[PDB]
Design a protein around this nucleic acid. Structure first.
Lengths: 139, 50, 134, 52, 117, 129
RNA sequence: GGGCGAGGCUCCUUCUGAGUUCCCUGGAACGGGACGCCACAGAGGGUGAGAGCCCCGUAUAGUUGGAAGCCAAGCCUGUGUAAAGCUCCUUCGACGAGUCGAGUAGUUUGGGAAUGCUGCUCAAAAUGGGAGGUAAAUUUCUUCUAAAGCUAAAUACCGGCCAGAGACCGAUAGCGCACAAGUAGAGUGAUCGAAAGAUGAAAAGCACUUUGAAAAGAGGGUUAAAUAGCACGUGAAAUUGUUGAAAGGGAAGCGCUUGUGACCAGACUUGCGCCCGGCGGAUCAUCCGGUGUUCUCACCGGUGCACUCCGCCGGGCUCAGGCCAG
RNA sequence: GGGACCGAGGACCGCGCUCUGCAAGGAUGCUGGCGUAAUGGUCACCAGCGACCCGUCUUGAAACACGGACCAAGGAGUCAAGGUUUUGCGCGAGUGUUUGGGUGUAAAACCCGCACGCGUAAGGUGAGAGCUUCGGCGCAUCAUCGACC
RNA sequence: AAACUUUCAACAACGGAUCUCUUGGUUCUGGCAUCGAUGAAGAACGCAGCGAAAUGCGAUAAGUAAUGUGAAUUGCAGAAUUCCGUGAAUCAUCGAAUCUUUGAACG
């Protein structure tokens, strides 16, 4: 045919609605981007097979692209919410990415994203009190 | 020839069957689109002069 | 979106017309809404304000306060409501300029002309409601 | 849809263009059996150790 | 080639769509006035003059007197029923005579006349 | 040249494919094809059906003529023979006449599929002058 | 052939949708959040800050009255041996003069067959005159009627009555003029010709007291703000005053590198993993059904019954953690 | 034997050796003080060393000469027509809709009739890129002998 | 040491840059055709309760008549309007008038 992931990357490597560009790096807001980095490896909306992990109320919601439904966005994403154990989410996410050959190159990134989201959901420590120095301290 | 489904007023499929009209298979050329769009967006302007 | 070529979307011309409008156009501009009771009594939404009207101030620093209109000062697009005043340095009270879009009419000064205005507005509204309904 | 097909047939002096490539999936094009079968053995790895 | 003052004699066509709209509105003004009637007059078929263009025909100014007579359309009535008349042109050939009388017969066959008042 | 002057995404895809082929094959065919893809339009003159027909008039029938150019139709030919032509772009009349003669239109990615080393391929260039 | 003529078209006018519902900030919601509504109307503007629904308007169909032009269904009449078109023919058929043209001078044109025009001199014709075609054998042929006149449309437009717009300019810009600008002013005169916008939502433009001759100052007061006082939005630099710190034997300023004094941005505040006990809970493994899926991986619900999971606490240990060094 | 400066890289791969390991393809181990203005940085001044006032113009170069009281704002290779080189794009012996006409949600976008502009209506010898069934085929183009107008 | 010259900072001055705004300009497009002896364009002098300019008007003079709208003007002062009315208004429209001296200017 005329269209492919390669064609889409050709069209969209220089500009996206998801593309945010600053001096220290180029990022992507795409939900199917496991590292929020602009690259063909991580361009989820570009690649035919892609993964995306988003926070849930308690756990992680993992979306994956269905290759037989690219023409149907409302039914194009296999969504599973993993709200059990941290170790069990990692097991399931790493299987969804590496057992049957759907993005084993993104296995590590997916597991890391799940871990980061769970750590974010973990309760947060109070701040240490601020200590003044020198002129401000004596003031 | 591929097929597209027709949707009713309620959002559910009606069962109708339609074939892609052979134009959705045309090449996608962002450079040509850029050139044509640049010209065709200048084609609306009103003159100004001191 | 505008369709008729006679009307213009020019900010410059619109502001010029608003700020150089004569007194009758200023009256039409300083039209004010009616209360709900008057709304279901007359089938009229808004009417130009006049000197004998009783209004309720519902916007501005004066929260929800009522009073009779004292003067419609068409020159600077303000009306004066009775007992809504501020004291100067000397202690003399001066009325506060309030806007008809900020006031709402509670009791309406009635005469033949305003009865005719209400009848015309009601007739148009009911004709269009009947046309839309059937 | 009907009239889209009709109007693109009715355009005069214009036909639907033919692309310069037939398969746009370079992954299939390269990792196809023909290319890999006629292909030469790799001369190195992506990240190569530095000797001296 | 700017030895003269083209700057004071230069013209731009920024009103091309405006004049197109104006001309279209003029054609509708004619058809509002001459509502059941065509907005033009029937013009004859004439062969182009020179050797370069004599292989083609175009529309001429008006029909000749004797070709109107052969078609059976009276002279004083033709401009009234919407046929252009050219008293300067001579047929000089049975070919042109026959082509134009056939055209007038087709006009006759496709015309509708209303009975005066 | 490292990057093509063209903005065509499909020519860029062909450049990537034939770059991989030139790097991973011993084929001077692939190397020359990549070079001719990098060169510009004025250096890729059209090749005519007449030129191809007289380049197959000898014992080179039943072959794949590869031209990295646009193939043009020649009205001076009353008859077109059967022929396996691959090129960047064809004219409508060139496609029609080749397909009526009984040949098949081929693209460069297809030629990479069937003939990734340039076997039984007649590589042709158009008139520069 | 005439005269009335309902009615119609054009243009002005009358009238026609929906939140000021609840909470927060605010001097003031037109801002944020919640819940609704209208939409052939989410153009624009005003209103104490970004308003489709507060107001004017905006979209479409109608509707109220008026103005002048044109068309006009019909209805009254018509008249006179009145006018008109065509046809045929043993009858006729008048067409522009000091104008053409010739010579000459000037001017003009791509145009000495003078391209046109004007002036001077001479000054026409009637199967005539003008312009072309042409070696074709003689000036054959072709095509038109000048010296009298009228005429809408397609065409131009820095001016007139308006109207709508812009990838224009934004107060040293844009017209010279956003202002009592062709003004003040200059020149005998013809003419030349500037500079100059912004308090505040609302003047609410500071009552009263006191010092001062007064101008003003200080209290006090208005305001969200006087760090907005009609020398008024914001308020740079050049230049200046006061205070703070410092340097300075006939230049200062600048580069590299310390030192003193003053003043500061970081980094760290512990993270991870094992051994114990106390717990407290909910998603230990396996199996059963449904669903989803990459067809072998998951998800629920049951099962699990707490030497298995998951979080906390009271302890112990490992590793990794900032700066300067031996 | 004594001293100085440096520690680039970041799983394994290799060359080796004195091979239970190693000084062999780049620094580790142990320990102390402090954990804050302590290191570090910015300003001002002192100190040692260094150091012509910028631009223009002329000349082989200098010197002369010219401009420079300071600050804010403004300020100088633009637009059009006609040629021409290269690059990108579409169609390609053809190409160019926008004179004009037909639609239009109306200066947009979409469509098009007849013209018109520009262009178009045979080899041998030897090389030669690239193919080969390894017997040879032979693009473009070149040198010579050619063939025709 | 102070003073003076110079450097840096804080605040206060001078000046009006920057930002923001704009009843203005500039350019294009569209409908229409209308000055004057029935006295034009222009110039002058008058007219408001309190006005110099701008604006309006002409001894009927910041204006009269008529039509429409429908309750004002506004800086102050004084009158209104009965509001169940031939009727406020620096209102709008506009078909009737008034219209000083000149200026083509005409005893």
């Amino acid at each position: 045919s005329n269209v492919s992931a390669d064609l889409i990357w050709e069209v969209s490597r220089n500009y996206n609605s998801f593309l945010v560009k600053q001096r220290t790096g180029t990022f992507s807001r795409d939900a199917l981007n496991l590292t929020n980095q602009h690259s063909r490896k991580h361009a989820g909306f570009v690649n035919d097979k892609a993964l995306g992990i988003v926070p849930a109320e308690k756990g992680v919601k993992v979306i994956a692209k269905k290759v037989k439904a690219a023409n149907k966005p409302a039914s194009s994403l296999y969504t599973v919410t993993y709200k059990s154990t941290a170790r069990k989410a990692y097991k399931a996410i790493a299987s969804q990415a590496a057992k049957h050959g759907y993005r084993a190159d993104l296995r590590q990134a997916a597991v890391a994203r799940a871990s980061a989201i769970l750590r974010s959901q973990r309760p947060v420590k109070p701040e240490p009190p601020k200590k003044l120095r020198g002129a401000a301290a004596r003031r | 020839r591929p097929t597209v489904t027709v949707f009713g007023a309620d959002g559910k499929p009606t069962g109708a069957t339609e074939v892609l009209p052979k134009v959705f298979s045309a090449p996608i050329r962002p450079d040509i689109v850029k050139h044509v769009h640049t010209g065709m967006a200048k084609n609306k302007r009103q003159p100004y002069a001191v | 979106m505008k369709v008729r070529p006679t009307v213009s979307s020019s900010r410059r011309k619109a502001r010029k017309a608003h700020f150089s409008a004569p007194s009758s156009v200023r009256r039409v501009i300083m039209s004010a809404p009616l209360s709900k009771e008057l709304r279901e009594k007359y089938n009229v939404r808004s009417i130009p304000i006049r000197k004998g009207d009783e209004v309720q101030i519902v916007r501005g620093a004066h929260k929800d306060k009522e009073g009779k209109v004292t003067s419609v000062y068409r020159l600077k697009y303000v009306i004066h409501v009775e007992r809504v005043t501020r004291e100067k340095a000397t202690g003399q009270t001066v009325p506060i300029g309030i806007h008809p879009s900020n006031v709402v009419i509670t009791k309406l000064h009635l005469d033949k002309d305003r009865e005719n205005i209400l009848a015309r507005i009601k007739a148009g509204r009911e004709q269009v409601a009947k046309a839309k309904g059937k | 849809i009907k009239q889209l097909d009709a109007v693109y047939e009715s355009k005069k002096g214009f036909f639907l263009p033919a692309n310069i490539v037939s398969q746009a999936d370079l992954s299939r094009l390269i990792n196809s059996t023909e290319i890999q079968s006629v292909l030469r053995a790799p001369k190195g790895e992506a990240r190569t150790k530095r000797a001296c | 080639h700017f030895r003269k003052h083209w700057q004071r004699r230069v013209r731009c066509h920024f009103d091309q769509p405006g004049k197109k709209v104006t001309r279209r509105l003029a054609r509708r003004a004619k058809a509002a006035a001459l509502a059941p009637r065509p907005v033009d007059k029937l013009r004859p078929i004439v062969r182009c003059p020179t050797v370069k263009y004599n292989r083609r025909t175009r529309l001429g100014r008006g029909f000749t007197l004797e070709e109107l007579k052969a078609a059976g359309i009276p002279r004083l009535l033709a401009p009234t029923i919407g046929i252009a008349v050219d008293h300067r042109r001579k047929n000089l050939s049975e070919e042109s005579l026959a082509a134009n009388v056939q055209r007038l017969k087709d006009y006759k066959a496709r015309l509708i006349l209303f009975p005066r008042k | 040249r490292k990057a093509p002057k063209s903005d065509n995404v499909y020519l860029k895809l062909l450049v990537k494919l034939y770059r991989f082929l030139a790097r991973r094959t011993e084929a001077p065919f692939n190397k020359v094809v990549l070079r001719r893809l990098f060169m510009s339009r004025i250096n890729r003159p059209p090749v005519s059906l007449s030129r191809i027909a007289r380049n197959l008039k000898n014992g080179n029938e039943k072959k794949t003529v590869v031209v990295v150019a646009t193939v043009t139709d020649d009205n001076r030919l009353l008859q077109v023979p059967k022929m396996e032509v691959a090129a960047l772009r064809f004219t409508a009349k060139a496609r029609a006449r080749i397909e009526a003669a009984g040949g098949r239109t081929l693209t460069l990615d297809q030629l990479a599929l069937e003939k990734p080393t340039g076997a039984n391929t007649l590589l042709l260039r158009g008139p520069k002058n």
